[PDB]
Design a protein around this nucleic acid. Sequence first.
RNA 1: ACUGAAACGAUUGUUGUGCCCCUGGCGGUCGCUUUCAAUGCCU
Length: 84
Amino acid sequence: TKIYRCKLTLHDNVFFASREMGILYETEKYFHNWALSYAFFKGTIIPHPYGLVGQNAQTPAYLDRDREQNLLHLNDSGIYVFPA
RNA sequence: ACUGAAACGAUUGUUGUGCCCCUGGCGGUCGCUUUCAAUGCCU
């Protein structure tokens, strides 16, 4: 129902390790939706555990109801960010 | 797990070494301490 046109201005340099070739690591020119969804709603809606240990420390929880860092909380909040 | 979690292009290094503000130069030239004067007056 509501739609928000949000324009993002970088106030310091942004890095994502999108691809790697030798000494060079580089960032794709589109911000992925799921990265922005946690940037907007983690701590406010999605939980933000400061620590991890175990399999949970190197396995995503993107769409796993059994884990706290889900993007599915937002399906239930009725919210969806698009990619940038 | 935001293509995620942590993330020093760093460490060391003398703008250095030699160098005469040097050489030449007459404070010089001209200039009368000058001009006038009773050892005097009386015995």
